[PDB]
Design a protein around this ligand. Structure first.
Ligand SMILES: *SCCCCCCCCCC
Ligand SMILES: *SCCCCCCCCCC
Lengths: 328, 331
């Protein structure tokens, strides 16, 4: 029964920085179709990536900005996790591609897919790896090129999804910066948000329709609005923080009315800042939460060290939540 | 500034069991390779491999492997707090497979995500699961490598038609009396991402689906050279991290990519003459993320390895990615 070593890393880990990338093309409600969109969803405009851009290329840019904001270079990073739904290759994964693009072609890394909640899972996994001693400093980047997956004839969701990327640096902090991860799924509602035709079935029958994103609105709305408050409470309990201590709330930027209901259910202070990046960023799935954090810090709405509650929710029916201290 | 709480989990974690699902369709070298009518065997060690049915998926096979893993641990779905699915052949951008897998086992509600790191998916997934359990995020998890690679194969690709295959195998990861999973050794060579790849991205394809379709492409010489050059060091780093010597390893479970690579690695790692070396590749081929746990499953089934034998795992593949650890054999 030979000894296998037990190891550990730094106990206190937090967000050292965030960097964000949004593509340049402003897309209006009048272009992604064929008066009440803003009212119903909270969206006015979104950003679409260029043809030559990819989830991977945007991840690279966000990571560059996150390193710069941390006072770090790529040689300081031990690992990278890319989280996404729009890396349109079965292999290779985007993480080593990003690693090489940053000039650290040899560092560990993998891709994490958990629908919209990928970021919360990816954060928790980096936190755990570092505390476990598998790394000291990591990049976690949510990146999405959703624009090509949208059926422009589907008024059900055509105005929802968008493009962009955002990265956080995660590493040793003087005090705990990332609370315990509260996560879960509802695999019985896997169909509620989906690619409608798998790629192989499509490739094997090219005379058929191509795949696009499909959404089941009432079922999604119902689930989020009514279960996400209890998830938020578990995240606050686990972190040992009270609802009234939360300065910033970053729900997934999926729909404004869902997020409005959550705020009331969660019993946060009246002055708690609630992320509304959705209005000019739309729904950027895995990139949503860190894009919203960056946006709040940019505008002055949040400050480094603010207590933020993050709740990711979406496809698979997956959610991941945690309390953090704001970076930068 | 009030301080954020931390949680804690098990210190000592291990592979409690393995469960293996192999689809029933047996495929010979003749059938998958247009160019061949015995050298494929000599050059790679592959004689046959299993192909999933048309109706089967990476997700469906994962469920089956999970059921078997649970039964092999004497546990139920009630005992699992998390599932990581690792694959390269879940052919949906969304939804992920992990939640539908969890539902399939009656553990709807439980956390889960999919992990992709080419062939090295399993080692990263095993590493991630151990980390999560020690961090207090879960107490007992399923980690399942699953692959339906058969429909990605170009039967005219003389360099790779014979390589890839279907299967799934899961491990139950949980608290043990003594440390059962050593630290994770991992890394990449992102500058060689094109070495193993889908050749046409899905969106580029979606715009011209009546033209050429995507298939798996592999630059074999490049991959052979890199594995033979690099994996010895990788193996040594995993043993060093676990605090073990080469002569202490009982079972060597390298990725089932090519038998000749794996022989070169045995010699390079300086393992014991009598160290048991995984050769599941012979009738299973390269099942990517399912390879290591399927190979563990095979050594146990044949009784070539026993539960508790000290094992060295090395995964290597696309991305150019690798992930390694010393573990005790499950079952
Ligand atoms: S909440 C996550 C939504 C992500 C959707 C991925 C795109 C699916 C359509 C592929 C054509
Ligand atoms: S070593 C990892 C091999 C994974 C191959 C995934 C399939 C890519 C081609 C899809 C058409």
């Amino acid at each position: 029964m030979t000894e296998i070593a037990t190891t550990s890393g730094a106990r206190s880990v937090g967000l050292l920085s965030v960097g964000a990338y949004r593509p340049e093309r402003v897309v209006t409600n009048d272009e992604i179709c064929q008066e009440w969109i803003y009212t119903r969803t909270g969206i006015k405009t979104r950003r679409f990536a260029a043809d030559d851009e990819s989830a991977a290329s945007m991840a690279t840019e966000a990571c560059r900005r996150a390193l710069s904001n941390a006072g770090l270079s790529a040689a300081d990073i031990d690992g990278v996790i890319v989280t996404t739904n729009t890396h349109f290759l079965q292999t290779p994964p985007a993480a080593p591609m990003v690693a090489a693009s940053l000039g650290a072609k040899g560092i560990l890394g993998f891709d994490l897919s958990a629908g919209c909640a990928g970021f919360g899972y990816a954060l928790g996994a980096a936190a755990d790896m570092i505390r476990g001693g598998g790394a000291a400093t990591m990049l976690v980047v949510g990146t999405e090129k959703l624009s090509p997956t949208i059926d422009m004839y589907d008024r059900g969701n055509c105005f929802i999804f968008a493009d962009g990327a955002a990265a956080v640096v995660v590493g040793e902090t003087p005090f705990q910066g990332i609370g315990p991860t509260v996560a879960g799924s509802d695999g019985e509602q896997a169909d509620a948000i989906r690619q409608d035709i798998d790629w192989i079935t499509f490739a094997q029958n090219p005379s058929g329709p191509r795949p696009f994103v499909r959404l089941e609105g009432p079922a999604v709305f119902r689930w989020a609005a009514f279960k996400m408050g209890d998830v938020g409470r578990r995240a606050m309990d686990a972190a040992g923080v009270r609802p009234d201590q939360i300065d910033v709330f970053v729900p997934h930027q999926f729909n404004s009315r869902i997020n409005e209901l959550l705020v009331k259910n969660l019993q946060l202070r009246p002055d708690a800042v609630v992320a509304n990046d959705i209005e000019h960023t739309g729904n950027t799935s895995a990139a949503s939460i860190p894009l919203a954090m960056a946006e709040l810090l940019t505008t002055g709405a949040a400050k480094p060290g603010d207590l933020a509650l993050l709740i990711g929710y979406g496809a698979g029916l997956s959610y991941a939540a945690q309390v953090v201290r704001m970076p930068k």
